[PDB]
Subunit: 152 residues, 6 copies
């Protein structure tokens, strides 16, 4: 019922679970030309690894499970991140790995383009909307915000 | 390590939580010209609503929480579904709504292009890969399949 | 509504990694009774049963690679009559078959299901193992015709 | 490695989610003659409904989500409950319905015969083991109890 | 490794829907003591406190729309010192703030946190409310330098 | 609506996940003088460590994941435990570590003072309420207990 405009130059969040970090570094390397045209941001460890392995400049927030997940989530809700690339691990996710559901649900709340694997990431990155504005329909949350609060 | 080729004409799964079903129907409607080039399959209620509201032909499996989730997951694992559009509800998901994590985890296992909202779906559908072959890198599970089994 | 389990059962056999040897021993101890039925298993569990015991077991994919969903589909299609799922309540691994989603579908369709060997022993000892059994199943017609909200 | 012997006269826990309570009452009624040979115990509301509808004597602990789940779990761990009949709701489980996983995991820990639907309950109740001793194999938890405790 | 809470605290106030009136009554009962500190809340909770009590509270977004993460970010950045989170253990709604994710981050950073009014009363009665408090923070140096698997 | 009175001499549960056990022991050691004025109870492994390392008397129930969690939860619901100190591990919780959610939700049900980290525990222990009676407001569950049970 409402609209969010993604700008022409995107801010792209880059996050990987530990067992997918090398996969994400390889994906960034293969798409370095396209990705470095945009603003890149990452959780602490993923971002340090991209910089150490590739020399690609990426803004870093805290490590995911130490608050980086919430920092990126805050920026999504504040319309400061436009695209999320999150390689999560469906087989060997570790106790400290970023929480998958909580991270993805906020992207759905705000109708943010989001990839959870490299095939989706390839489709997203190849879209012409990478380089234009994109008008994302969002739910009108005004009714939710004005909801009646129970007495008990 | 291993590579899977998505065919030019895709099989696209269509699934929506109850509070997103109308959104998915409108999304299918606005992309009908592009979508009818592909094979469409859906959970029972979602597929029935698409067919009744739009007259668009969709193969229907069982209702999601009655087993349709597992039927579509089986087809994903069997490489019979190439793209998944799953509009799930991040705010008002009902007790009977299809389990989000278990469904999308299997897409990640097999590196399936997958959208959880209409913005991701628009990016996927606008990709040139929508109408050409796409080579998806598949994780190697040979080590996992040959893993040591504990004694107790 | 009513479902009828056939005389000869189709029995799914699934174990978490730390319970696989227990499941193999259970199949070995009950081999005479079990091989009268159709046995099906996730990939690794079925491979282990066939290699360790020489008992014939149809194998689907490994549980976390899709085998869970393949067996779940057969449960929902009433092609599996009995589920034996030894899951690990103490050291379940990141890749172990997800417990809730697998057993919730048995409850949906009122499928006999064991989650440990004591339940499996009680199920296998029932006279219903080798005869037909008529199970009451929940009525889902109202659910299937439910009103769909506008947003 | 270790053995736990169930006595000839069993203690049977009876628990149902709200939308399965009438099903459980009908099941108890159908098996009342067999069940009253044993010791029956139930969560607060379930037991109240059984006594009120059927006149069958059932010991009652607190309501499930108010602590009754933990009271029954304590008795399972203390070998004071031998069989568990838990009709939980796979479709319309309510916010307050007894947490399924936590309850049944303890039954699995101690290898307790347990039914989650009436078909399993019918198979269990028809076992000859209902009326005899039954030797249940349990894991030896001594190694776990003596495990190395990490320094940090 | 020691973090110092200042004398004047920043206190987050959050409640699930069926606990909002309880939190408002609690804030009301302790208004004199609480307004000595910096109060911050999720959107609806803070709106309710201001509308019902006239107590000044900085408001972030609604919890499930991102407010949970905004407060979590501030916790991780040591900008919130005390968290009062009345969550609903019986009738939590589909949109209610994610309990585990919210309180986990307080545990990560050893933040004083209340999940019910009794804990909130104990926290507010502490002499540490109005003095500095030295909080031990877990060492994450080993975690931050952990080896990253090849796949 | 209802009121629960904590007595001046408290019963305090002490529980730690494995990677937090040394932290909890060190915390008990720093507060031993104040704590030994009260009735201390713990899960099996945690309690054994406190007794052996500190010479502090602690009643021990079973190990947490073997039923000790439910034993303490039962006592919480029966108002036999007044304060809960539960150092759980937000980073490296193991498969066998005590279920965090189920344990703390029951403390919230009965409005039990509860600490999940040492800073909260320090605030609780410094409270003037530690050594006096304290009246806790508890939700009235009478309406919940008398709720209508659905027919299907």
């Amino acid at each position: 019922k409402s609209i969010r405009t993604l700008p022409e130059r995107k801010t792209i969040a880059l996050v990987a679970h530990d067992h997918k970090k090398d996969d994400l570094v390889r994906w960034v390397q293969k798409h370095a030309g396209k990705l470095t045209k945009h603003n890149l941001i990452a959780t602490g460890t993923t971002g340090k690894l991209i910089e150490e392995d590739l020399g690609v400049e990426v803004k870093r927030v805290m490590s995911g499970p130490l608050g980086g997940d919430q920092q990126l989530g805050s920026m999504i809700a504040q319309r400061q991140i436009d695209i999320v690339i999150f390689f999560w691990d469906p087989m060997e996710a570790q106790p400290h790995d970023s929480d998958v559901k909580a991270f993805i649900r906020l992207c759905v709340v705000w109708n943010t383009p989001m990839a959870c694997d490299s095939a989706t990431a390839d489709f997203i990155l190849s879209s012409p909307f990478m380089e234009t504005e994109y008008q994302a329909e969002i739910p009108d949350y005004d009714g939710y915000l004005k909801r009646n609060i129970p007495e008990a």
